[PDB]
Amino acid sequence: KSEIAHRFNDLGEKHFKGLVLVAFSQYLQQCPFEDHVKLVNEVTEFAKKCAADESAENCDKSLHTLFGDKLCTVATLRATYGELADCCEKQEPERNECFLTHKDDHPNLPKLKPEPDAQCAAFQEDPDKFLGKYLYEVARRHPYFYGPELLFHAEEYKADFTECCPADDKAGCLIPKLDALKERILLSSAKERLKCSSFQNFGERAVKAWSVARLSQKFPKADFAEVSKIVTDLTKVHKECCHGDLLECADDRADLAKYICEHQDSISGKLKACCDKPLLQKSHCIAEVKEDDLPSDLPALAADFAEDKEICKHYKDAKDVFLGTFLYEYSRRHPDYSVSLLLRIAKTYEATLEKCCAEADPPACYATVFDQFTPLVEEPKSLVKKNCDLFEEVGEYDFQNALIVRYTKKAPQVSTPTLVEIGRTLGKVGSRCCKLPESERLPCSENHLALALNRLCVLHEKTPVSEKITKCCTDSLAERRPCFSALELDEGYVPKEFKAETFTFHADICTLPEDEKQIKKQSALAELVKHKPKATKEQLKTVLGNFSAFVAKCCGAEDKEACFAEEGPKLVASSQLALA
Numbered sequence: 055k056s057e058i059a060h061r062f063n064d065l066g067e068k069h070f071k072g073l074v075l076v077a078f079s080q081y082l083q084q085c086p087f088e089d090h091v092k093l094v095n096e097v098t099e100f101a102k103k104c105a106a107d108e109s110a111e112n113c114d115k116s117l118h119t120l121f122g123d124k125l126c127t128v129a130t131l132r133a134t135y136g137e138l139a140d141c142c143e144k145q146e147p148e149r150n151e152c153f154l155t156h157k158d159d160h161p162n163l164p165k166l167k168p169e170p171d172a173q174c175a176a177f178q179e180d181p182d183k184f185l186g187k188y189l190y191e192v193a194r195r196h197p198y199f200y201g202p203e204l205l206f207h208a209e210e211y212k213a214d215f216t217e218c219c220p221a222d223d224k225a226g227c228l229i230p231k232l233d234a235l236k237e238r239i240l241l242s243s244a245k246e247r248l249k250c251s252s253f254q255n256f257g258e259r260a261v262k263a264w265s266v267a268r269l270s271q272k273f274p275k276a277d278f279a280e281v282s283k284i285v286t287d288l289t290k291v292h293k294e295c296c297h298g299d300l301l302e303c304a305d306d307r308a309d310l311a312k313y314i315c316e317h318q319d320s321i322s323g324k325l326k327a328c329c330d331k332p333l334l335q336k337s338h339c340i341a342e343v344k345e346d347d348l349p350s351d352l353p354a355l356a357a358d359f360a361e362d363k364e365i366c367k368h369y370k371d372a373k374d375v376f377l378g379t380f381l382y383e384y385s386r387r388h389p390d391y392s393v394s395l396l397l398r399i400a401k402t403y404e405a406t407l408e409k410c411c412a413e414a415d416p417p418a419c420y421a422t423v424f425d426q427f428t429p430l431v432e433e434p435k436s437l438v439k440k441n442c443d444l445f446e447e448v449g450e451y452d453f454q455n456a457l458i459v460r461y462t463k464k465a466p467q468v469s470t471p472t473l474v475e476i477g478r479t480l481g482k483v484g485s486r487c488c489k490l491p492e493s494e495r496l497p498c499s500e501n502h503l504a505l506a507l508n509r510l511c512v513l514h515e516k517t518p519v520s521e522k523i524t525k526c527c528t529d530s531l532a533e534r535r536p537c538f539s540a541l542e543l544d545e546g547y548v549p550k551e552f553k554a555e556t557f558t559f560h561a562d563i564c565t566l567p568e569d570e571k572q573i574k575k576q577s578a579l580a581e582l583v584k585h586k587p588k589a590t591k592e593q594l595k596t597v598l599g600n601f602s603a604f605v606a607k608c609c610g611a612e613d614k615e616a617c618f619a620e621e622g623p624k625l626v627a628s629s630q631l632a633l634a
C-alpha cells in the first residue's frame with residue numbers, strides 16, 4: 055500500500071535515513087549539509103507517519119513522486135540549479151529522467167582533506183552528524199556511487215576515527231587509513247560508474263552479458279541456471295541504484311545477499327567467509343568475493359560448441375540462450391581472461407555461427423571456431439606484457455608520463471587536467487596489476503583499463519571535443535579498449551600555439567606535496583606534446599628530465615625566485631629546439 059512505509063519497515067530508520075541522504079546529495083550536489091539533512095528528516099517523518107497509518111493522505115504515492123516533490127521545494131532552485139527547476143514542471147517519470155541528465159560527473163569540489171585535528175573534534179561531538187556529513191560529501195562528489203556500498207564505507211570511515219581519535223599521534227594513525235579509504239572510494243565509484251554507463255549507453259542486455267561473464271568466472275561451480283538467476287537479480291539491483299532508486303536498490307540487494315548465502319553450497323565455497331557476517335559487510339564481501347577453484351568435471355567444450363551437427367539448429371531456435379550458455383561455459387574456465395576479452399570472444403563465436411550457418415555445409419565451417427580465438431587472446435596479453443615490462447623498468451612516475459604522452463597524441467583536443475588524470479590513473483593500474491601472479495595480470499589490467507576509459511568517456515559526454523573519442527566511447531562496450539589502443543596521432547591536429555607562460559615555473563611549486571609537484575610537471579609534459587605532437591617519446595622524456603632538474607635546482611636555491619626567473623626562459627626556448 056505505502057511504498058515509503060514498506061522501505062522504511064524493510065530497511066530500518068538508520069539505513070533508510072542514510073540512503074535518503076545519499077540519494078539527495080547525489081541529485082542536488084550543491085546545497086549545504088544541513089539543508090539536505092532537513093529534507094531527509096522531513097521525508098523520514100513522513101515515512102513514520104505512513105508506517106503507522108498507510109491509508110494516511112499522500113502515503114500511497116510513489117517514492118519518486120515523494121522525493122521529486124521534496125527536491126522541488128528546495129530554497130533557490132533556479133539560482134543554484136537553473137536547468138533543474140525546469141525538471142520540477144514535469145510529472146513522473148519524465149521528472150526523474152530530467153533530474154538524472156542533470157547529475158554532474160565532475161563537480162570539481164574542494165578536495166577532501168584529512169584534518170585529524172578539527173574532524174576528530176566534530177566526531178567526539180556528535181558521531182551521527184559526522185557520518186552524515188561524510189555520506190553527503192561523497193555522494194555529491196560521485197553522484198552514481200553504489201548507494202548501499204557508501205553506507206558500508208561510512209562504517210569504515212567511522213571505525214577509523216574511533217581507533218585514531220584516542221591515539222597519541224592523530225594524523226599518525228589516521229592519514230594512511232583515510233588515504234587507503236580514498237583509493238577504495240575512487241575504485242568503487244569507478245566500478246559503479248561503468249555499470250550505470252553500460253545501462254545508459256548500451257542497455258540492460260550489455261549489463262547482463264558483462265555479469266554472466268564475470269559471475270561465471272567467480273562461481274565456476276554454480277550451474278547456468280543459478281548464474282542466470284543471480285545475474286537477473288543483480289542487474290535489477292544496479293538498474294535501480296543507477297536510476298537513483300536507492301531504497302529499492304538496497305532492499306533488493308539484501309534479498310540477493312540472503313539468497314546467495316542460503317545457496318552458498320551450490321554457488322561457491324569462497325562464500326562462507328562472507329555469509330558469517332553482518333548485513334552491509336556480508337554484501338560487501340559477496341560483491342568482492344574472489345574466484346572459486348575450478349571443478350574437476352568442467353565439460354570439454356568442443357563437443358557441444360564445435361563438433362555437434364545440430365549447432366545451427368540450436369543457434370536458430372534460441373540464440374540468446376545458446377550464446378549465454380557458451381558465455382557461461384567459456385568464462386567459468388577462464389578466470390585468466392578479462393571480462394571484455396570474454397565478451398569479444400562470445401561475439402566472434404556468434405559471428406562465426408552467423409557466417410557458417412548460412413553456407414552449404416556448416417559443420418565443416420564452424421569446426422575450427424575455437425581456433426579463431428587465438429589472436430583475440432594474444433593481442434591483449436602482449437599489450438599487458440609490454441606495459442608491465444615498461445612499468446617494471448621505469449617505475450610509476452615515468453610510466454604515467456609515457457601514458458600521458460601516448461593519450462595526448464591520440465586525443466590532443468582533451469583538456470590537460472583530463473589527460474594527466476587519465477595517464478596517472480592508468481599508471482596506477484600498472485602498480486596495482488603488474489605485481490600480481492602472471493595469470494592475474496591480464497584480467498586485472500584490462501578490467502581496470504575499462505574503468506579509466508569509461509571515466510574518459512563520461513567526461514567526454516559532458517564536454518565533447520573529439521570525434522575519434524566519441525566513436526570509441528559509443529560504438530561497443532567490449533571493443534572500447536582495442537578501439538582506444540588503435541588510436542594514433544590525430545594527423546590533422548594543428549599544434550597548439552606556443553605560450554611561454556604555460557612552461558614558466560615559480561617558487562610556489564617548491565612547497566607543494568610530491569604528487570602535486572608531479573601533476574605540475576605532467577601537465578607541462580602534456581602541453582609539450584600539444585605544441586609538438588610529432589616529438590618522439592624519447593625527446594619528451596629528455597626535455598622533461600631538463601624541467602625537473604631545473605625545478606629541483608631552483609627549489610634548493612638561496613633565492614628560489616631569481617633562479618626560476620634567470621634560468622626559466624633559457625630552458626623554455628631551448629626545449630623547443632630539442633622537440634623538433
Ligand SMILES: N[C@@H](C(=O)N[C@@H]1C(=O)N2C(C(=O)O)=C(Cl)CS[C@H]12)c1ccccc1
Binds near residue numbers: 072182186208
Ligand atoms: N548510525 C547511522 C548514522 O551514523 N547516520 C548518520 C546520522 O545520524 N545521519 C543522519 C542524521 O540523523 O542526521 C542522517 Cl540525515 C542520515 S544517516 C547520518 C548510520 C547510517 C548508515 C550507515 C552507518 C551508520
Ligand SMILES: N[C@@H](C(=O)N[C@@H]1C(=O)N2C(C(=O)O)=C(Cl)CS[C@H]12)c1ccccc1
Binds near residue numbers: 264401
Ligand atoms: N547479437 C549480439 C549483439 O547484439 N551484441 C551487441 C554488442 O555489441 N553488444 C555488446 C557490447 O556493446 O559490447 C555486448 Cl556487451 C553484448 S550484446 C550487444 C550478441 C552478442 C553476445 C550476446 C548476445 C547478443
